[PDB]
Amino acid sequence: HWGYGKHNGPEHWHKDFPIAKGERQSPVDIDTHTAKYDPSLKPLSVSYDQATSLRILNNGHSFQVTFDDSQDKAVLKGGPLDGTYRLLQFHFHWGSLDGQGSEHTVDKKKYAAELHLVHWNTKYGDVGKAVQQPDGLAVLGIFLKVGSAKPGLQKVVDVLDSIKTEGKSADFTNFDPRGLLPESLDYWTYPGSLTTPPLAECVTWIVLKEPISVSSEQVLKFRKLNFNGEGEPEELMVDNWRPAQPLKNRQIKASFK
Ligand SMILES: [N]S(=O)(=O)[C][C][C]C1234B567B89%10B5%11%12B5%13%14B%15%16%17B8%18(B961B%18%152B5%163B%11%1374)C%10%12%14%17
Ligand SMILES: [Zn+2]
């Protein structure tokens, strides 16, 4: 029932998921002048060399690439994190035009899209258990701006025609998510939540300062997807982003000066 439209969008979500109005909701605006450099923060450790992608899926809210998370193959550690977080999937949020689409904003600036690599804490054993914990998930967030093409995104873009509508999926093996990363791993971090229902307050957010550049042709292919199932009135999958939420009693910390 939930979505991003007038009648089921972010302003409605609190009725089914009252934590929508909680103390540690995501996304937020990153005020770069207020974020405190924290020299105790470690560099982020991103170990994706043995990542095993499985499937690409249109879930009705975004598209996602799922990975084998039954061993420590593709893991996030270090940074603000204690212990080891396994990559489960990545997905994106994007706009109807280039001036909106990201969930986090930086000094109120919206990017055209935002990539989320979702990882869960292996000390909880599975992702259902992890989402019930305040340190269950770590989501690595990467901004997209429109410019030059991102070569490492092209293999994703070229199969989107095969998953146009909600429920469709396809084989998507041997995809290397290292090809989605910017040069710098400089980041901001804060405690937050899932940005979709169930909005569980279980996420350590790690948002990279450096955006990736994607081409107008790449993002245009995101915009051809459909929220609807096949045979329903065609409603383009665009503006699938939750707006910034109140920061409340939270501090955003920077890994960099
Ligand atoms: N936009 S976001 O905060 O990364 C939430 C992404 C959606 C999900 B929530 B649940 B938790 B894990 B799986 B399923 B839904 B799916 B993934 B994360 C599980
Ligand atoms: Zn997301």
Side-chain angles (χ1 to χ4, degrees), residues 2-35 37-41 43-208 210-223 225-248 250 252-256:
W2 75 263
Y4 295 94
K6 181 54 157 186
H7 298 284
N8 65 357
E11 298 316 305
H12 293 269
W13 291 350
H14 74 96
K15 292 177 281 176
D16 273 4
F17 305 97
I19 207 168
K21 295 186 186 285
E23 300 303 303
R24 59 172 278 186
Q25 289 287 294
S26 295
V28 298
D29 182 57
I30 296 158
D31 191 78
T32 61
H33 289 112
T34 301
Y37 169 55
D38 184 349
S40 66
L41 286 172
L44 192 68
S45 171
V46 183
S47 301
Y48 291 171
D49 55 285
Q50 296 298 321
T52 297
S53 60
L54 297 170
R55 305 288 292 176
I56 192 167
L57 161 67
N58 178 337
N59 59 35
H61 314 292
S62 183
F63 70 92
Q64 63 183 81
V65 174
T66 309
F67 289 79
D68 175 15
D69 64 345
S70 62
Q71 313 179 66
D72 293 2
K73 278 180 185 197
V75 302
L76 193 60
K77 302 157 52 56
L81 309 169
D82 297 6
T84 296
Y85 290 64
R86 285 183 192 162
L87 178 62
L88 171 57
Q89 59 101 299
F90 70 76
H91 64 272
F92 300 78
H93 301 270
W94 66 88
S96 48
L97 290 184
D98 296 356
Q100 57 187 36
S102 76
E103 293 206 307
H104 296 89
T105 56
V106 177
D107 298 334
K108 305 301 177 97
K109 177 188 171 49
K110 302 173 158 84
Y111 288 90
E114 185 174 332
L115 168 58
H116 288 164
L117 295 123
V118 180
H119 312 79
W120 56 273
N121 192 329
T122 61
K123 80 203 202 95
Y124 301 121
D126 67 69
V127 72
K129 284 288 190 290
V131 298
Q132 304 176 240
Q133 299 296 341
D135 57 351
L137 272 62
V139 186
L140 182 56
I142 300 176
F143 294 119
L144 281 60
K145 63 176 192 202
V146 178
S148 301
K150 189 70 174 187
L153 183 60
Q154 195 56 36
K155 182 163 195 205
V156 168
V157 163
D158 285 332
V159 301
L160 293 185
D161 72 292
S162 77
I163 60 157
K164 179 170 187 191
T165 43
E166 171 180 20
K168 290 195 104 207
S169 73
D171 279 314
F172 201 66
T173 53
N174 305 103
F175 181 79
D176 182 359
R178 292 175 296 180
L180 300 174
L181 305 176
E183 287 184 353
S184 185
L185 295 180
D186 284 350
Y187 64 89
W188 296 285
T189 185
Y190 75 96
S193 74
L194 313 178
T195 72
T196 64
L199 305 171
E201 292 183 330
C202 65
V203 182
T204 301
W205 275 101
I206 302 167
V207 183
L208 297 185
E210 183 183 327
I212 57 168
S213 291
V214 299
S215 64
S216 49
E217 295 89 355
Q218 291 178 318
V219 70
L220 285 177
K221 291 171 185 192
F222 288 14
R223 296 190 190 128
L225 295 162
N226 276 192
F227 285 126
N228 51 280
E230 188 174 23
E232 314 182 330
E234 169 168 36
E235 301 294 351
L236 292 178
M237 185 182 279
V238 291
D239 297 318
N240 60 343
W241 48 277
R242 189 187 197 197
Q245 299 302 304
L247 187 59
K248 302 189 164 162
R250 289 182 288 179
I252 304 177
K253 289 166 187 169
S255 80
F256 61 93

